[PDB]
Structures are given as C-alpha cells and as structure tokens.
C-alpha cells in the first residue's frame, strides 16, 4: 500500500525535487537528476499529451505518497464539492494528517511523518490517531504524545524545518511541540508550479 522503493529514482523520472528524501544534503549532490533512470535515460523522449497528463498526475501522487484508488476517490470528492475542482483536489491532499505533520515540522519527510502517525505518536484534538489519511479540520490542534515527544528525530526535524519556509495556513508552537491548522490553503499558498488542470483533464477522460 506504500511505494517503499528507491525514492531518488522517483525524483529522477519526474525531473523535479519532490522533497521525498530530505533537505540536509542537496538532491543534485546525491546525484543524477535531469536524467531518467534508464540505461536509456541519456535519451529523453518526445512524451505525448497523454504522457504529459500522466506525468503530472504521477508527480502529484509521488509528492504526497497517495496510491491511485485513494487518489481517484479524492478526485470524486473534489469534483462533487463546489468550487474549483483542482483547487479542492489540492486542498483535500493538504488536509491529510501526515502532510500536516510534515509541514508543521515534525518528521523530516512525508514518509517519516507517515511512520510517525502510524506508530501512534500524534494526537489531534486530544485523541491519538493511527490513520495517515485523516482529514485535519480547520481549528484542529496537532500535537504529539508524552512518550514520543522525547524523540530525537523530531528534534532534527524541528531544526531542518526551521530552515524550511514555515507555511502560513498552519501555526507551529515548536516549544510545546504543538500546532494548529488555522485555515484552508488556497492555490497561491501552495507550491505555485504544479498543473492541477492537467490532472482534472486526465480523469475527465
């Protein structure tokens, strides 16, 4: 149900830093981005329109860790909700619990935040939650358990997320190891580059 394979190969097929390794050593300094993982990656392809749509959908699915049946359920939920369907699709993906954990600064990656949520560490509104795909409501309080507060990888994640950009739809306390999910993010808040119109056009066929 997870990918659990080579992650930098996923970053290299797309050609974009998906932030799915970490941030400490740089990703070009790991090596070999701009190159597909072939033995034929030295030759880049013509990559037709259905290929381009599929590559943007694969990019957005790999940058969060969501599999395809959950992703098309998210598409149906974004489609039946009123408003811009692609913005609803990105809002429903940012509403996931492990993403809120990784953005708030606990867990250095999204897979690390998923292992943190999985292993019963994180309490949202005074109750611990097992499920990574839990939708964090606005004005919810995301915190850690007693025992998992004294966990050193959460300290290192607090440091390298201090070097990160501190996204503004959530507010981190960082000293009580708490935060709040203040509001729903809009398109201008998040990531500025991904083409959600290509994703909605794929499932619309």
Partner 1 sequence: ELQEKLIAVNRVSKTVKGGRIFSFTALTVVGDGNGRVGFGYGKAREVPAAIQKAMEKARRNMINVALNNGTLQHPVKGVHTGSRVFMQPASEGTGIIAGGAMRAVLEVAGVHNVLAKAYGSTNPINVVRATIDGLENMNSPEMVAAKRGKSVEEILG
Q: Cα 164 to chain center, whole Å?
A: 14
The rounded distance, in Å, linking the Cα atoms of 53 and 196 is 10
Partner that binds at residue 87, options RNA, partner 1, none, CB closer than 5 to 8 Å by kind: partner 1
Q: What value does the CA radius of gyration of the chain take, rounded to a whole number of Å?
A: 18
Return the number of the residue (25 or 80) whose C-beta is nearest RNA.
80
Q: Cα 165 to chain center, whole Å?
A: 15
The CA angle 107-111-116, to the nearest 5 degrees, is 50
Partner that binds at residue 85, options RNA, partner 1, none, CB closer than 5 to 8 Å by kind: partner 1
Helix (H) or strand (E) holding 12: helix 7-14
The rounded distance, in Å, linking the Cα atoms of 64 and 60 is 7
- Of 16-24, 34-42, 151-159, 182-190, the segment contacting RNA by CB under 7 A is 34-42
Near RNA by CB under 7 A: residue from 15, 23, 84, 129: 129
Partner that binds at residue 25, options partner 1, RNA, none, CB closer than 5 to 8 Å by kind: none
Least CB distance from residue 166 to RNA, whole Å? Answer: 27
Binding residues for partner 1, rule: CB under 8 A, are 49, 83-87, 197-198, 200-201, 204-205
């Amino acid at each position: 149900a997870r990918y659990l394979g080579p992650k930098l190969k996923l970053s290299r097929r797309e050609g974009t830093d998906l932030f799915l390794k970490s941030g400490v050593r740089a990703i070009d300094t790991k090596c070999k981005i701009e190159q597909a993982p072939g033995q034929h990656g030295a030759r880049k392809p013509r990559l037709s329109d259905y290929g381009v749509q599929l590559r943007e959908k694969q990019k957005v699915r790999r940058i969060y860790g969501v599999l395809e049946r959950q992703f098309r359920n998210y598409y149906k939920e974004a489609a039946r909700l009123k408003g811009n369907t692609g913005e609803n699709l990105l809002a429903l993906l940012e509403g996931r619990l492990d993403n809120v954990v990784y953005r708030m600064g606990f867990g250095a990656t999204r897979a690390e935040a998923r292992q943190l949520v999985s292993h019963k560490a994180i309490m949202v509104n005074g109750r611990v939650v097992n499920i990574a795909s839990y939708q964090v409501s606005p004005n919810d309080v995301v915190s850690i358990r007693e025992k998992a507060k004294k966990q050193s990888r959460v300290k290192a994640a607090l440091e390298l997320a201090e070097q990160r950009e501190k996204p503004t739809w959530l507010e981190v306390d960082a000293g009580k190891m708490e935060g709040t999910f203040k509001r729903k993010p809009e398109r201008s808040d998040l990531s500025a580059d991904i083409n959600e119109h290509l994703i909605v056009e794929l499932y619309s066929k």
